[model samples]
Target: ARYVLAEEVDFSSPEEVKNWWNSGTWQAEFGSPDIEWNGEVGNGALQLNVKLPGKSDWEEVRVARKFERLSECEILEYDIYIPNVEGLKGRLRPYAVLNPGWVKIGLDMNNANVESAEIITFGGKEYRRFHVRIEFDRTAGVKELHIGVVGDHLRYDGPIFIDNVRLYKRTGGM
Candidate 1:
């Protein structure tokens, strides 16, 4: 009755967590994000204190992990916690790095179907949770997944949380 098949990256343990690495070293000039474990959520979550410099036309703070193989899933589900901030306009794009004889990148420009999951009250403030679902090519032989945040509003220095990443197999008709 459920489509959930496996849990991917929950960041429960630092050892079990994916080796998430930031993209560019030059981004350090613009306040490179500090990756840490966020205790605001369940057991643990990937938290990044990002600072947007508001100038670079194509600036992004991307965290990526290499996988041995990830080609059997159709849908990916994850949770994002965004704190309230003025002019907090950004795009969280999920990308798939595939190697079907050559390197290819697949991006879900549809923005990954963001819908509200919950409103959490923490430390006398409200933090909103958004659930993300994105589809990728199951036959493309994906080798890595990159989650990048692109700032459009700029000058935003705040924390964003990611947790409970799940992968689902396509369910047959009931």
Candidate 2:
């Protein structure tokens, strides 16, 4: 299906991504997540640093943004790159945080627990390339689309790269 890209942080515009580090574009519900933007990952990918103290948990950093509330949505795709790191391979995943809380669709749900599957990747260089497609619902009402990575049961595995985030809707159905 075709795609409608919105509320993006692909680092396609490094300037925006650079400003985003302190900008309200990304908010932490708890911890002061050390986030970085660099070309090392995927030539302008957004990556998260290890969890530091004084924060609840570096586990889930919420990507809070307002976009055109779509009446229907289907595929949510991302260009993910897991660098040469440990503990991060099987523990990182994305979430849908629209309301106060969030939701996980399909395999992308629980990259936290053995409760979820490892984010599989196609062969790449030092960083394994993962193109993740998350199936979602035809959400209306609220225009809030909250989705970001969660580093579950893991610690300092370097940084995980997130890029090219897009949400797509087919003609009518979700």
Candidate 3:
């Protein structure tokens, strides 16, 4: 199997970051969120911060961005850093927002395309890397992308970073 890099997100500066995911929506069920770019995470990364006021029945911290349509996408891969901090307990997942629907990538999903977190260190701090590789319907045509932390009967509040976002298309012989 072969694949070609179709697109990559540049996190060098705020301008480039916004051009890719302009006007990203930050919604929290029980806390405030701060989104920015941090160079320490890895080269440079999309930093998502959550400040929880208190725990709730449902906990969700999501950042969604609408963008131009992308077709024939075979794989979506990225590196997400989950800091081993207190008051943070949940799973980090990725979502490919298709033309009219979406597909989530994780072990929680009822499919083989799942991701697991590995222990990793960043900036002298121990963190879990949720190295995500999601293979979805190539013809679905992506319109948006979302990164979220969701939990039921749990509380998660802290910062998570994501970097090296790339999209691949299958090439060579099928």
Candidate 4:
């Protein structure tokens, strides 16, 4: 019951995210979203680590990037690892911003837990892979990829990790 996108992209590498951030597409845009992260690449994955200041008014601290040509692909995928999930008052969610409202359709672990596949992982930590499929509304096209955790007014502060991020274009139905 869906249109297929034969053109697929493998963004499993952190370099891909960097390239997208630095690409002409991003530069040509009116205003680029803030790209911030203290993550590293190791163990065949891109790890995101955000250290929020203690007892501060920082509403949110996340490792995110902005994309304009969202119509280029479907299914934004990635692996997430949480080493310091304790005291985490918020959940790490990846979302898409649409016209007047934001769409956070992917499975979440904060606010309320939506169902997730619970992907495999090592390092004896909590890891989950997320697949996000979004269609270009033409009416309300995607604005950007908002990835990271929403802070609860400094209730919890620690590092966050993510890995194996990719984007794909599928063929046929979902």
- The TM-score that candidate 2 achieves is 0.61
Model 3 residue 4 lDDT score: 88
Cα lDDT tens digits for candidate 2, 148-170: 66554444335566777776667
| Cα lDDT tens digits for candidate 1, 1-174 | 345564388887666444876654223222434777765554678886777665543345666666554566666666667775444454444343334433333354424222323576656666666666666546555666666555443445677777776766555643
* Stretches of candidate 2 exceeding 4 Å from the true structure: 1-9, 18-33, 52-58, 69-71, 86-90, 99-125, 172-174
Give lDDT tens digits, candidate 4, residues 34-152: 33232332254434334444343323433445555454455565545444343434333343332224554343433322233344445555544444444433324665555444333
> 56 in model 3: Cα distance from truth in Å?
7.4
Top-TM-score structure, candidate number = 3
Instruction: Give the Å error, residue 68, model 3.
Output: 5.0
Q: Which stretches of candidate 3 lie over 4 Å from their true place?
A: 20-33, 51-58, 65-69, 86-88, 100-107, 110-117, 152-154
Question: How much does each candidate deviate from the true structure in C-alpha RMSD?
Answer: 4.6, 5.8, 4.6, 7.9
After superposition, which runs of candidate 4 have C-alpha atoms over 4 Å from their true positions? 3-14, 20-43, 53-58, 62-69, 72-79, 84-94, 98-120, 126-144, 164-174
Q: Model 1, stretches more than 4 Å misplaced?
A: 1-3, 25-33, 55-58, 86-118, 122-124, 171-174
Query: Can you list the residue pairs that collide in candidate 4?
Result: none
Q: Work out the TM-score per prediction.
A: 0.68, 0.61, 0.70, 0.46
Residue 152 lDDT (model 1): 42
Candidate 4 — what's its lDDT?
A: 0.40
Ranking by TM-score: 3, 1, 2, 4
